[PDB]
Amino acid sequence: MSREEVESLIQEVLEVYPEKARKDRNKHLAVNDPAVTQSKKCIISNKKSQPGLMTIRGCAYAGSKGVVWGPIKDMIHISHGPVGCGQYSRAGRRNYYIGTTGVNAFVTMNFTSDFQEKDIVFGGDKKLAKLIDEVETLFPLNKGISVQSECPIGLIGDDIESVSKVKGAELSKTIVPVRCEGFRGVSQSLGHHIANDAVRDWVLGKRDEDTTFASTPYDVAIIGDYNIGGDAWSSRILLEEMGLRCVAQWSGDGSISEIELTPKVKLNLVHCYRSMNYISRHMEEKYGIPWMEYNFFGPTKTIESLRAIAAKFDESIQKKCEEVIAKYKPEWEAVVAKYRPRLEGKRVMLYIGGLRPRHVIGAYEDLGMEVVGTGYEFAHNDDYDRTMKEMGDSTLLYDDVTGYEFEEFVKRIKPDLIGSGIKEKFIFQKMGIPFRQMHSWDYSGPYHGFDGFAIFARDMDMTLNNPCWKKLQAPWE
Amino acid sequence: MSREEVESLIQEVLEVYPEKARKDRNKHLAVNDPAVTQSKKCIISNKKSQPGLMTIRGCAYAGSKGVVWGPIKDMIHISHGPVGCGQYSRAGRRNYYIGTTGVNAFVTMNFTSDFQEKDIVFGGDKKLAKLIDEVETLFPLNKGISVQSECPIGLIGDDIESVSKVKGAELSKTIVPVRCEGFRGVSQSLGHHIANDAVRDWVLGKRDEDTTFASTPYDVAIIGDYNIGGDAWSSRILLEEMGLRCVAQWSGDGSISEIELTPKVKLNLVHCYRSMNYISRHMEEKYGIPWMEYNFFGPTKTIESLRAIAAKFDESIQKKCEEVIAKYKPEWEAVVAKYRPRLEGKRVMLYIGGLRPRHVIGAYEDLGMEVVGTGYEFAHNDDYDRTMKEMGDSTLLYDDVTGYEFEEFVKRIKPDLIGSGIKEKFIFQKMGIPFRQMHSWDYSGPYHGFDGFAIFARDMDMTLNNPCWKKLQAPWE
């Protein structure tokens, strides 16, 4: 499709809306121009969703509890408020870890204060204090507690900070209050920021005056990898084959001690910019630790990233970098040789959260595929700035896409594959469009790194080329 | 029911038959009189079945391959002829054993010569010789081969005895020809006798001139226990606790060497008279080994048997006998205390093969139950002689019962429980009559010995008293 055709498509879709929604949505839809450097000339983002339009977005509690805190394995995270939020988010996100669940690790469990009417009427702070004691009794190997506020906490005027300070002092325990109520912000995004500031204020400085950890010049942290299907492990392996020491993973398979040790590293490696840029900037300000963005999706981006990272160190790391690249060359080349002919020329539309809608484009291109549309639930304009140069000319961009818009765009554009989430998957399959989950990896993965690219390729092929897709039309018409 | 009522029940049931069948069937139905010791005054047995009347009987191959030879665990038994017989009988009978199946033990496998038209037309003796070599190649740890003839072998004039002799000599292997074709005799019974004579002629004399066996005064063999659900093991344990040494089990869990060692024992203990009286008489005639009948069903019979067996030995065994009885007293007493109040007065009808229709009556009586009818598929008059004294006055006896007769007798008698086989089970359940399989033990057992009595009691209770039996009548009918 040409620019003019995509613009026409946008106008046609917007016709269904009442005027206020139409005028708003027009600002969140654009036709890409890779020359443009300032996306605030092209698209508005990180605004409230329009009522009634079936946004795909979540809330700040999802961004804090579900995304940043929840993966930290040796802490207990309390979903504080009524029972719903913790139950729907229990083990939904595949932030993998090694541990003994219920004993020294707690990720897939749902701890909650299960608010009842009396807690709403009279407040939940006494409940919370009693709950903390019960956690200590029944889960003695926990290494800290977080309190993930749900909608009612701030609305009723509870003071979880006081409970956290008092109990944390009484028990000599890190207890982190997190004001991630879902009424805050407009999406998951503000939950990330809130969560980063809670790490800063309650965890990260614990060892500021401790000189016992033996640092090395090659110490790094992986910042913003939540280890979906093991993604962070298949990244870490490469960083360490290159001669680095990965002191911490934030927060997939993450432990509280590795967070506390992070201020000792030489370089913060940021994968998810959206969720962790806040704490990365903080660490540069306070500890002088530099940070850099990287991308481990597909061989082109992974090789480029390994080289750029190695260039921050000495010649010995650069030499190991080239060794790593040479080791994996035949492996990814064999993946390309097998799968690229099966996928060449196929067109994909993506819709994901805050990073992957741009970050996976190189991996698709490594299989000869074209990303013809992409968009994000909760990105900011700094993410769109990074996106416009990664997307082709005249491709479609959508911020906080409505269900209606996404369906209508797909009907016109007729992509060969869609990559999005669980609320989208079954719609597009019934339309006869191969669909891959690009949050949960459709229970597959990892997708990061060289070992991840093999699985990614296998998965796009198994789905796009599956025999089921030729069968949707009954042969009697 | 009085004698006159039972007599008139028999007459009524026989009215359906044509004259020739009516006259025959009248001779195989009787009202018990425990005064009688010559059953040839009251019932005819071990005659042909009348055509078309749905006998429950099997054939001589069932009696030889299925019953006597099949359980011998370290031999390979060939079902020789077309494919049906070996397939229907594969693992149907629960003759338990310890071994590594397909390697050193072969009981639940089906080896066959799968006769085709060319084998019928030209004979199967060349196929048999080739089959033996293939067995030796693929199953090198087999300790001998039997050849279980199916109907066509004798009909076509094959000479399996010549093949067995020639191949057995060539391979220094025991290869046993068994002429158990199903056209022979009238039932399973002649298969037992055939099989016994085959053991005599081809196996039992192998160690006649070998004096190396370390014999003791307390050596016995269990003759005629096929270890259904482990029945022989729960009998053996008691004999050995009493200080005896069980050199052999014929043939449940039995090995070829233990059969060959049997002529070295001091006493043959016969459980199944019908099936193994032949070889027991042979052993007394040739080796001077005495034999005695015993019964390990229920505590009364088991205690009586232990005492009678111990009386054949010395004071040390008699003393151990009373120790065994004292040991198990609290165990069976507790079974009686729990289950007898649940079963007292309930009436049972049995129909089984050659032994159990009389042998289990004492166990029922140990639970306060009454056996109001019993009968056998293939018993001889010597079995009926042993039965009339075990059954109550005016009870019903049936030899080679027809399906029609069995149903009609049950309709009049209205037993609380029936104990019979797989071809009977589902009929009587649909009639609302609790049913227990008294061949396969309904996949339960053992039933022999003290440990078996607990399971027997549990089982009769779980079925007779099950809640399902109150539910056959729809509340609207």
Added chain:
Amino acid sequence: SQQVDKIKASYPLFLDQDYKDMLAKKRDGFEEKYPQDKIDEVFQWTTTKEYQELNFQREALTVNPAKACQPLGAVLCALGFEKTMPYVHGSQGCVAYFRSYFNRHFREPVSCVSDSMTEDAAVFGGQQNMKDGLQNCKATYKPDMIAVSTTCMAEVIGDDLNAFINNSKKEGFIPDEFPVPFAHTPSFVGSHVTGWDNMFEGIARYFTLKSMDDKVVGSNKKINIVPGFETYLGNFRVIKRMLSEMGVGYSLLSDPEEVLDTPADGQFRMYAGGTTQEEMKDAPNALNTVLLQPWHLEKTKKFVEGTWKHEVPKLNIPMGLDWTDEFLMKVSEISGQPIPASLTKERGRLVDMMTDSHTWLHGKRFALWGDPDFVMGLVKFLLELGCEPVHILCHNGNKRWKKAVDAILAASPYGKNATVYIGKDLWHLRSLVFTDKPDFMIGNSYGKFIQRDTLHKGKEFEVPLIRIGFPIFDRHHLHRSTTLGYEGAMQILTTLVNSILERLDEETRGMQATDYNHDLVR
């Protein structure tokens, strides 16, 4: 590393030596992990009676609940009405969760909207969100009805749904006659089933309260059926099938079976099937109203009895043999239709199955959980099978319900070793299956973690999970199954007995050790 011919996903990739070594280095260098001996010691302690006592003393902490929040149920109820959009007034994060939860269970699209209230609404309330949200939803998704519930933000700030909807109509945002039934659904009261009851009663009121003067009980010759919160497609289907076989006129009120099972034929259908507005408007003209799941339909029952004047029969959920019999006999009484030959034979086929399978079921011990009506019907059927339902857990159960279940247990010798637990969660249930080990658990997918814990103690302590309930996320297409009626009982029986036989085969598969009992025939 990968070999291109046999690519490894996370399992078993991370068991390769290089990954194992890496993970060991991460642990040792940076995780400051408790020593394995201390982990083992604490694990063992969590399996004990001492731990169980402390666990059951909890007053403030809930761990691994077996319930969800009201608006989930309101959404499911709403989905059962023709061309109806569920609409939850409040915070959008809730709706992403409700949709995903049902998406995972049904493996189907789940349509629901929010009006996206933010922090700014704490000053002035959500009235403007309702006005624009209703207008936007109607224009964009073209429903014929919008069924409104609430999230907990909206409940805490006190938004008056009725007034907000009225003002929306007054100011022209949606048409005066456009149906917008509503219910307050606070997550901090009851559970998801309470949200279903509230939503249903609000829809029933919307279509009938003001029009009662022309209604005559019995005049349409039908029986209304209210299913409650139901997540097996076979359950809607079997009730419709039985009533049709009997020639009984009926109206199933809230019927999502079409919209939760659209064909994959090249189009997406946002709406399919469902109870019509005409059916809800005519409902007071039925002979009577039968509640399939009365223990979470108490508000509905009060409305149906007090306003429609229907003499709602005292019937248990139609699960198992006795309660299916009772349901059919009552339906026969109300409708005047006899129970037909087809259903009598189906009943007799269930009884045949019971007679065939009784020996393996007898005395088998189960732990189980779920919503109150499901749980009590499962308990009743287990007693009918001669099984012992020893740990009966209903997190969202109440005292009156518990008394009813205790009375069912007293009517059977197979109830003698059973205890009913209310307000307890799956971390409580975990203790019970260690301290008083049953043979199996019957429960939802959250049970898999209990099975995992029990196996860790040892193979002899493992309690296998049998998946019946909601949600089931780790198997495919079990939402197609049936638990109600004779069909449901046949399905449950078959599942139980074959679970037993599968485990027995596992236990007897050991060559020369336990395979003496590896029987071909069982």
Added chain:
Amino acid sequence: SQQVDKIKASYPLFLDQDYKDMLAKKRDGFEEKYPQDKIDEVFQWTTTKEYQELNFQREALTVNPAKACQPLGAVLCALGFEKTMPYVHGSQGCVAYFRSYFNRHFREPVSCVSDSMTEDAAVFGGQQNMKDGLQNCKATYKPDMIAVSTTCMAEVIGDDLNAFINNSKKEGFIPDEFPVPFAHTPSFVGSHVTGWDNMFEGIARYFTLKSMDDKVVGSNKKINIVPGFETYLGNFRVIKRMLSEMGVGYSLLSDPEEVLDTPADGQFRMYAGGTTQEEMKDAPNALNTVLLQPWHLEKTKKFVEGTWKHEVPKLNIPMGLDWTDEFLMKVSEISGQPIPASLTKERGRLVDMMTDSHTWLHGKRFALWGDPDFVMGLVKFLLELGCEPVHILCHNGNKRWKKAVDAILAASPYGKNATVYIGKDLWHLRSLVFTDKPDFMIGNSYGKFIQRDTLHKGKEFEVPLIRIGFPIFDRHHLHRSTTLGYEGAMQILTTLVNSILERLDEETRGMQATDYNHDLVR
């Protein structure tokens, strides 16, 4: 010893120390057992390619067949006719076995008689057995038809069934008009499916050969359906359901679904349902005849084509998506009835399930066995699912069939690593699953012993069995299932994908070792 409140059956009784020690003493004293090292050595050898080569060179020995003998199929065929007694002329041992084999699979009574020929009949033949057998059977069991087959004794001695039956009628043993169709069913030709073909063709000839004069093709506006040897009740039911939904007039010729599923209501019903004599007599007046399982209905096809002049369509078994589509399109063409909306939607629901489950099915490797039509239909559906059917075993298959399956494999890239075996048995299959290990086996209960053997090599080599086929003796009520049509495909898909997910859960259940991948949601 027993503890009365926890009685042990054989498993685990014989693991008590006293029993273990006793068994060890028995072994050491008297069994002269090969040393355990030698047993292990030989076991390991039986898993090798070298052993496989020797195994596949067998010419005379068969081990663990996957077929039975002709009269078994004749009996099943005969049971499908109204008030019909199967009667096998020859030896009674055979009938005890036929009855028990089906009793164990259906968990139902199975009525069949013998005429009890003995050794004496080798002089003089079985004529008198037939005369008294027919008279006795008619008088005692009151069938409306007796359907006569043979055991191998009767075939070897050469009894002329036709002449014996005619003489029975001539001499007044049964009425001239009483129907006594017959077929020769030698066990040493073909297999049980051949006996079904032979019996059916005999019954078809009996009712039609001599009355062809008044028949006009198409005059009754029905399609005849011949199911073949079929041991899933759901398969008779689905075909009838689909044809009824489509408004197609039909006659299902041999229909045992009622007699193999009588209710447990206090009476025994020796006969129930079945094809009527009127239906067989009127069958030539149909539009056409469809063969559900054409690869074992060749003799029937020749009769239907040659005598009834029906143009039997070339249709595969209606298994999987494409072949169900073809069956419906052909039935639509023959009958003039359009394919109704209900079946179109059912189709699309299957397709939806395929899209939902494809990622777990993709690339999964299967070994499988059964009868030829069942096997080819399973192969086809596996290819439709993106699975690889790598070992395809049909003991009773033929060369023409093998060529047909090889063509089906060639039409799909998912067939590339697949081989079809005919004349080979389950001991051959055992080798294949060791040397070229698949993910799962799909087969009957005899497969359990292969799974046992594979686990003995190691957990990593275990090949789990998925039970689909005949006989299934170690699970309860699987004979109620469906494999045909869209319903059958939905059932097979669900069973396959959940088998996969069960195994994945087992492999990922290890605390801190593999449970990183023990996902709640799959």
